[PDB]
Design a binder for these strands. Structure first.
Ligand code: SF4
Ligand SMILES: [Zn+2]
Length: 402
DNA sequence: TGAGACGGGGACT
DNA sequence: TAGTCCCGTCT
């Protein structure tokens, strides 16, 4: 079992927690496009599709970044049938710059499955949503099911994890499988049976605007009377959920002692050489060369200027890049390769350093443009399915140009 | 099982 | 400044 200092053994505490959080939400909730669409869309499938898209985009992405992407998505594909007919290229174009591009592909595949195999009907429970929809894990299933279908299911995102680890003073490593089970148990216990969707959004919004990672706003916290972390700074525990013997306590960290942060290792340094090959084209030039990454691994299926991966001691070499550029353009006068500078793009796991080069041709390449290579205008590149790193490479190529 | 793969940026000091 | 933390799913 566990201690009651770590659970809500008093139903009055749960009832007060629901009413306090919901009351704060009822007078402070942020105006969001997917919240308006949900409360007015009477059709369950349409309503679930709007919630589905928002919850996928919100994965590891802040609300402020999602709002513009969600609006563009719903404008282009207002219905599941519209998304089901879209190409993966189009999805990658709209997802450009949002990050974690597998979310877009699976969102399109899932809608394609709903329309083509389920008659356009969304599963109505978190269990079946998670079972049938790719890219819909445990959070997104409970998110869709509670918000769109009123199923009484609690969810745990990063915000709820931070709120719960503080309210019940959980100081263990939150990523371990046992505290993860206890957090989802607390969420399923606390979720309001009458308003499960509004409860989950209230909990998540509380962790984004009040119970923030740094400098929380307890002077404005509605659940400050049910938080064990807050009362300590002003009932003690009897373990596996408190702070370990090696886990240090800090008087100057306040309630932010919880949750215990996991010191991440800095990303591995990788090095690459990329070049923006240009030709004058006709009207609307110049045209720049884009090639498509493999449909696996990092930035799968996106378009990029021709690049080569180099070991650190070779990061300034040209021979591998020239060999790559001659694949798509044929023979190339090599002394025209101009070094423009470097671009450092940070992934969650890779620190990539691009040595950016530029190559301006006088006319069209003598060899025919092989398949897999496209020559785009500048406007077409800015709307293409490319990663932000390549947009950084282009804007540098645009600066060092006359 | 679980620990790394998988993007980009917003908001703190 | 230039860091530092942090906003799920899958294999
Ligand atoms: S009292 Fe402080 S630590 Fe507790 S939930 Fe509210 S903001 Fe978070
Ligand atoms: Zn304990």
């Amino acid at each position: 079992s566990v201690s009651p200092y770590h659970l809500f053994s008093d139903v009055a505490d749960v009832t007060a927690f629901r009413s306090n959080l919901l009351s704060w939400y009822d007078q402070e909730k942020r105006d969001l496009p997917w919240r308006n669409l949900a409360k007015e869309e009477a059709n369950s499938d349409r309503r679930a599709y709007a919630v589905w898209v928002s919850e996928v985009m919100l994965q590891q992405t802040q609300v402020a970044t999602v709002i513009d992407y969600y609006t563009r998505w719903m404008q282009k594909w207002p219905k599941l049938q519209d998304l089901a007919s879209a190409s993966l290229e189009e999805v990658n174009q709209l997802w450009s710059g949002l990050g974690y591009y597998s979310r877009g592909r699976r969102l399109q595949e899932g809608a394609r499955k709903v329309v083509e195999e389920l008659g356009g009907h969304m599963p109505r429970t978190a269990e079946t949503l998670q079972q049938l929809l790719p890219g819909v894990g445990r959070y997104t299933a409970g998110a869709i099911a509670s918000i769109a279908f009123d199923q009484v299911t609690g969810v745990v995102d990063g915000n709820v994890l931070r709120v719960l680890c503080r309210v019940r003073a959980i100081g263990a490593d939150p990523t371990s499988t046992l505290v993860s089970h206890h957090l989802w148990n607390l969420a399923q216990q606390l979720v309001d049976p009458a308003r499960p969707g509004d409860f989950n959004q209230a909990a998540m919004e509380l962790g984004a605007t009040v119970c923030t990672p740094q400098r929380p706003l307890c002077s404005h916290c509605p659940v400050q009377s049910l938080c064990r972390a807050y009362q300590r700074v002003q009932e003690e525990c009897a373990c596996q959920l408190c702070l370990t013997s090696s886990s240090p306590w800090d008087p100057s960290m306040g309630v932010a002692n919880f949750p215990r942060k996991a010191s991440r290792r800095p990303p591995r340094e990788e090095y690459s050489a990329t070049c923006v090959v240009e030709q004058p084209g006709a009207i609307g030039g110049p045209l720049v060369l884009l090639v498509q990454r493999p449909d696996s691994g990092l930035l799968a299926g996106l378009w990029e200027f021709p690049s080569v991966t180099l070991e650190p001691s070779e990061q300034h070499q040209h021979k591998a890049l020239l060999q790559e550029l001659q694949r798509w353009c044929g023979p190339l006068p090599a002394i025209r390769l101009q070094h423009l500078g470097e671009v450092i793009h940070i992934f969650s796991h890779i620190k990539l350093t691009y040595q950016v080069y530029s190559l301006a041709l006088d006319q069209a390449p003598a060899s025919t443009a092989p398949p897999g290579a496209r020559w785009l205008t500048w406007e077409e590149f800015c709307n293409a399915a490319v990663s932000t790193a390549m947009k950084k490479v282009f804007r540098m190529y645009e600066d060092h140009r006359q």
